[PDB]
Amino acid sequence: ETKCTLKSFTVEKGIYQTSNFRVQPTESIVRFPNITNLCPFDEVFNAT
Amino acid sequence: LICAQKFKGLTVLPPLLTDEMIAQYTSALLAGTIT
Amino acid sequence: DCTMYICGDSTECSNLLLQYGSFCTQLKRALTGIAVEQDKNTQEVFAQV
Amino acid sequence: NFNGLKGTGVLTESNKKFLPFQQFGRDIADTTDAVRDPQTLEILDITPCSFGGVSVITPGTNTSNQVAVLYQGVNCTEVPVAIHADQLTPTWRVYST
Numbered sequence A: 001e002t003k004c005t006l007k008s009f010t011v012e013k014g015i016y017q018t019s020n021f022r023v024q025p026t027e028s029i030v031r032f033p034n035i036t037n038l039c040p041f042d043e044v045f046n047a048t
Numbered sequence B: 001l002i003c004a005q006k007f008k009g010l011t012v013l014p015p016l017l018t019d020e021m022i023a024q025y026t027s028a029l030l031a032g033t034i035t
Numbered sequence C: 001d002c003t004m005y006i007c008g009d010s011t012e013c014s015n016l017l018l019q020y021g022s023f024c025t026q027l028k029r030a031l032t033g034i035a036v037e038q039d040k041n042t043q044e045v046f047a048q049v
Numbered sequence D: 001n002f003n004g005l006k007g008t009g010v011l012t013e014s015n016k017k018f019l020p021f022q023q024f025g026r027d028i029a030d031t032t033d034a035v036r037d038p039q040t041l042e043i044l045d046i047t048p049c050s051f052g053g054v055s056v057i058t059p060g061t062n063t064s065n066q067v068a069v070l071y072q073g074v075n076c077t078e079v080p081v082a083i084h085a086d087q088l089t090p091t092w093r094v095y096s097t
Ligand SMILES: *[C@@H]1O[C@H](CO)[C@@H](O)[C@H](O)[C@H]1NC(C)=O
Pocket: A010, A011, A012, A013, D060, D061, D062
């Protein structure tokens, strides 16, 4: 990982700071408020 | 709290010389000049 | 650390930061030199004997 | 995605006490950090993931290839969790415990 950050194949002695270079692409969730507030669609669509 | 919200990639690295070793440095300086 | 500061955890933001590239390497390396100079400052000020 | 809030993070149970009307939550840096679950009305805290980087202690590549790794300030009873070492390759987990 510190070979990748320096972009060199030989690294001298000392302390370095590496990048992340690691990944774990996760899933997603979407929570939005409870749906209740129904419509009078049944009234217009269903009748006699 | 002081450094809580500022972990958006910013960090405050601690000094390499701690406060007690600097105290011994100053103690040596003061113990050499008085003798 | 740029990948954290300039934008939070996000794949495409880092992907497009790759195009800019070396500014970050120059910016991180700019601050480090400062930190090492601070340590050297304290070392040379206090450690005479 | 809560109530039109877009972001990335890890959600955990929180401790702050809101008001009956207040919903969001903002920190000093003016970013969302606490969000109330729309359906069941508790409070969840948002924390960053993916610890950005570590510091490797290595000698010259002339001598050898064994290295040490320093974690910045983290108490290491949870570095297997903080690093998320479970998903790492087995080579990394040598330096994880
Ligand atoms: C490895 O050793 C050679 C000869 O001793 C030297 O020229 C070179 O700089 C060294 N490389 C390091 C220490 O990374």
